[PDB]
């Protein structure tokens, strides 16, 4: 009865895709990370309404050379798309339109949920992307905004709450 949800994680290198996905699946911060090559797969079984759901996260590569022939594979039968930037890096945020264009060119359906996540919110003194800027971007693209920290998983929007909210939204096929 265990159904699967393929959720891909997309974004510039070093915004924290590996740390976020690992934080959700392992329940700890990575001892050490390296640039993801190709993709890494992390899964977590959870229960929602007594039904068993496997949240299958694809931790994609942000470097061009390390994602070069993978994008078709990322987008095949994807159930949801998570875009990620670094709250302390404005350039990672200005990248989102190109990530969105890639998504729009590779999706095979018009009803696949997308969400927007700002990471490293623990780095308050070095934040470059104010909430209202991110919020407007998110709203005008029909995406919820989350501001979060893989390093400190209970700060602002809880890391657990992001993927669990998304999984609840997928399971019940609700807005």
């Amino acid at each position: 009865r265990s159904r699967i949800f393929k959720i891909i994680v997309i974004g510039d290198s070093n915004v924290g895709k590996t740390c976020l996905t690992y934080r959700f699946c392992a329940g700890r911060f990575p001892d050490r990370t390296e640039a993801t090559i190709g993709v890494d797969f992390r899964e977590r079984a959870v229960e929602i309404d007594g039904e068993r759901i496997k949240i299958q996260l694809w931790d994609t590569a942000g470097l061009e050379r390390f994602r070069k022939s993978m994008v078709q594979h990322y987008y095949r039968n994807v159930h949801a798309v998570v875009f990620v930037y670094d709250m302390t890096n404005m350039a990672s945020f200005h990248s989102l339109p190109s990530w969105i264009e890639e998504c729009k060119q590779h999706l095979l359906a018009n009803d696949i949920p997308r969400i927007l996540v700002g990471n490293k919110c623990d780095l308050r003194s070095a934040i470059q992307v104010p909430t209202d800027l991110a919020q407007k971007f998110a709203d005008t693209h029909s995406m919820p905004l989350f501001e979060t920290s893989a390093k400190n998983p209970n700060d602002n929007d809880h890391v657990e709450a992001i993927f669990m909210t998304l999984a609840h939204k997928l399971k019940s096929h609700k807005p």
Partner: protein, 86 residues
């Protein structure tokens, strides 16, 4: 030598020597010593490209397998649901 004379040509004799310690020979020398450096560089680069290409290809095959498995499970679920509607 505040006033140079003809015997100060024995100092030009010194320069026709200190020069040919480098003059021409060292050019053709370093040219080939570092036409060999270009080769080790291009070979190390080639090696990097083979490594990354091979890694990426394995990742692509793994992502393809996992997509196919997800698909199998999805067909199971739908088939079960169709059995249930009966």
């Amino acid at each position: 030598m505040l006033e140079t004379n003809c015997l100060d040509l024995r100092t030009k004799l010194q320069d026709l020597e200190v020069a040919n310690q480098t003059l021409k020979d060292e050019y053709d020398a370093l040219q080939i010593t570092f036409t060999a450096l270009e080769e080790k560089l291009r070979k190390t680069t080639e090696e990097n490209q083979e490594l990354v290409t091979r890694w990426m290809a394995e990742k692509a095959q793994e992502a393809n397998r996992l997509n196919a498995e997800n698909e199998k499970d999805s067909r199971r679920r739908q088939a079960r649901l169709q059995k249930e509607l009966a």
